Amino acid sequence: PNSELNIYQYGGGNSALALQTDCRNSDLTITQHGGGNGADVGQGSDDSSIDLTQRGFGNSATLDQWNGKNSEMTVKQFGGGNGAAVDQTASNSSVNVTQCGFGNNATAHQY
Amino acid sequence: PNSELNIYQYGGGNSALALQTDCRNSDLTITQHGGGNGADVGQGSDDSSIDLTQRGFGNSATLDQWNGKNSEMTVKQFGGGNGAAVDQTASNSSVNVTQCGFGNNATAHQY
Amino acid sequence: PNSELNIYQYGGGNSALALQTDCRNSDLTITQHGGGNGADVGQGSDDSSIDLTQRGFGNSATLDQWNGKNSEMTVKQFGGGNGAAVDQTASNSSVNVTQCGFGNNATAHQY
Amino acid sequence: PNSELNIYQYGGGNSALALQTDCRNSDLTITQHGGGNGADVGQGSDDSSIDLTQRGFGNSATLDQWNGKNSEMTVKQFGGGNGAAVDQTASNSSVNVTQCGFGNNATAHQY
Amino acid sequence: PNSELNIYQYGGGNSALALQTDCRNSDLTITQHGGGNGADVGQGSDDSSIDLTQRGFGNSATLDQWNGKNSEMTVKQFGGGNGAAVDQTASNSSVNVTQCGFGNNATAHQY
Amino acid sequence: PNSELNIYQYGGGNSALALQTDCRNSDLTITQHGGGNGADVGQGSDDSSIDLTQRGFGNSATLDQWNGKNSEMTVKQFGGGNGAAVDQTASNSSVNVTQCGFGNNATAHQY
Amino acid sequence: PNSELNIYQYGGGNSALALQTDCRNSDLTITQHGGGNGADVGQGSDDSSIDLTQRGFGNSATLDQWNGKNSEMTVKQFGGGNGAAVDQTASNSSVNVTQCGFGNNATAHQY
């Protein structure tokens, strides 16, 4: 099972927690640009992907992709203080969240 | 097999376009409070729900839920100039967008 | 059972209440142009259609189509302060109200 | 039962009340031009028609068709202050009232 | 069982503690350029590799790769005061941490 | 094969090169205190130990423990500018070099 | 074969060259105190020992122990400019050279 977890941080004060378990041929990528961005990502889904990109300051993301197969996550937060929380369990399914600006809130649930 | 689509406007200058076709056992609800809020919503998903509530001024929402089953979409825009675009094709899934404040932008795509 | 309920509002201060239940293969359409127009429309009839058009200011319509089949109801209110009250329960039946001008009152019941 | 109720009002201050019940394959039509004309028309007869035409001001009409079949009732009031009172219950029968000018009163009963 | 642990230190004030136990056909490499960089690396995984490179000043790294097989760790800290903490126990898995700038904190967990 | 290679540096300008290959059940330790100390150490010997201690400034040590078994090398350099060059291939043998002061040169070979 | 070769140097500028080959259960020890002392020692004799002690300045020693068994070699040079050259090959034999003062020269051969 070729499973890859990548964390790239540029700037200062960004924090990332990542978990990949029982997750075969799947990719989890976190890329944070700027400052004070927080990420918490769990992936336990086969042939699945999670891409998290935060660019700016004070953005928060909590992502959970569990039990699914052939499933995709994209989260892109541009700006300041945006909040994202997503759970994805559906198979052959995809979730996309894109927040631009200040103070955005998004919660997504796919079963 | 009951299908309901509802529009409520309170205030002035709010505009709503709604479409429900091939959409069985499904509810689409559109409620705007205030002024200048714009909504364009399409629902063709069985056993599915759309709820958009706009409260404030200049909020814009474009919602599309097609080919899904047992799917729920909720968009709530509080304040001014919030923008939301939501696409929903997954079955047994939920999208929730909650925008608070001014100038918020959110696009959610869930397949 | 393609059931569609459409409300289009252009201008300011228009209010529409629409209800569609137990209503198969049926369309309800409300179109408001101008200002201060009030609409209350309920439809529970199979293979039926409601068409309410209000163009002007201060027009009010109360429209109820219940327990009929293959029934068409149309109200067209042009101008100011027109009042229409229409109840339709007869099957395979049509009601048509046309008001032009100011201060008109029209009552129609079809059983 | 293709039953149609039509109200056309042009001008200002005209009032029309129309009732259609148990009235199959039948037409009720009211046409008011001008101002202050009053109409009260009841229709409960199968395959039968009412045509009321009031053109002018201050004309009053009280019209009832009940329990008839294949019955035609036409009232035409041109001008000002004309009063008409017509009751029709006979089947396969026709009532025609024509008033032109000012202050005419006409009463017709057909059983 | 060819097990190699290499440490290269250039400059001054860099300190590194490295432990390799029960770790067959596996490579652990530490390379520090500059000053005041701290490293603590434990490797007990078969056919696994850990590569740590710190370039700059005041960077801190804590890396634990345990019980895995065919597992890769890459940690690269460029700049000042970066902190990294990574634990990997998953087999056939890869963790990559890259920090650029000042004051980054990165945590990686892979089981 | 529990094989551990540790280098501790306290102070500034110290440089340490260490390689451990084909070396089962063996420890290589380098400890540098002060400034500008240079060490290069290779270990390929089974059940062997390397202890290099440099305390001061400008000390240089070149240590090669190859093809031996049950072999110990200890080199201790206190002060400034000491040079030691030691090669050890003999099995069940021990080499001990102690330099105190300034400008010492010592060469040790054991086959 | 427990074979030990130890060189202890205290002071400055001391130089020692030491060779132990084919020499089982044997000890070779050099102790130099002071400055400029030179030692060159080869040991290839079984169950035998070499002890060289130089205390002072400018002392020189060339010691060769070969093909003997159960042999002991001791040279003690105290002071300045002392010279010692010793070859031992005899079995069950001991050579002892003691030089005190300045400018002493001693040659020992035992076959």
Residue numbers in the entry:
A (entry chain D), B (entry chain E), C (entry chain F), D (entry chain G), E (entry chain C), F (entry chain B), ...: 41 to 151
Provide passages from the article that reported this PDB entry:
The curli system consists of seven proteins encoded by two discrete operons (csgBAC and csgDEFG), which regulate the assembly of a major structural subunit, CsgA, and a minor subunit, CsgB, into curli fibrils. Using cryo-EM, we have shed the first light on the cryo-EM structure of E. coli CsgA fibrils, revealing that the amylogenic regions of CsgA adopt non-centrosymmetric beta-helical structures.
We chose an engineered CsgA with two designed cysteines (A63C and V140C), developed by Balistreri et al., as this selection offers several advantages for structural analysis. In addition, our E. coli CsgA models also confirmed the previous prediction that the core-facing residues between beta strands are imperfect repeats, leading to the formation of steric zippers that are non-centrosymmetric. Additionally, a central slice of the CsgA fibril map in three orthogonal projections revealed some additional density on both sides of the fibrils, likely attributed to the flexible N22 region.
